[PDB]
């Protein structure tokens, strides 16, 4: 339950939020100096995204709005 940084790299090409089915956002803290954003894609693969990129912020928000609305 208490893990060091889970991401070794972030995925740098924008993609459409339709391909995200689960999101985890882990704020920085003693476990990891960086906030980590980990997405699970439709097919089950997992990648990490740079929380500072605008496109990332927007994709996460679009996923959240869709998920919240069922």
Token output for 49: 């995204």
Domains in the chain: ranges and CATH: 1-70 (2.40.50.40)
Method: X-ray
The C-alpha torsion from 55 through 57 and 63 to 65, rounded to 10°, is -120
Token output for 18: 């339709």
Resolution of this model in Å is 1.0
- Long-range contacts at 59-68 (CB < 8 A, ≥ 24 apart): 59/14, 59/15, 59/16, 59/17, 59/20, 60/17, 60/23, 60/25, 62/17, 63/17, 63/20, 63/23, 63/39, 64/23, 66/17, 67/23
């Amino acid at each position: 339950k208490e893990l060091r940084c889970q991401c070794i790299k972030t995925y740098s090409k924008p993609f459409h939020p339709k391909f995200i089915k689960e999101l985890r956002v882990i704020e920085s803290g003693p476990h990891c100096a960086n906030t980590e954003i980990i997405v699970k894609l439709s097919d089950g693969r997992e990648l990490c995204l740079d929380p500072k990129e605008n496109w990332v912020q927007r994709v996460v928000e679009k996923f959240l709005k869709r998920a919240e609305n069922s």
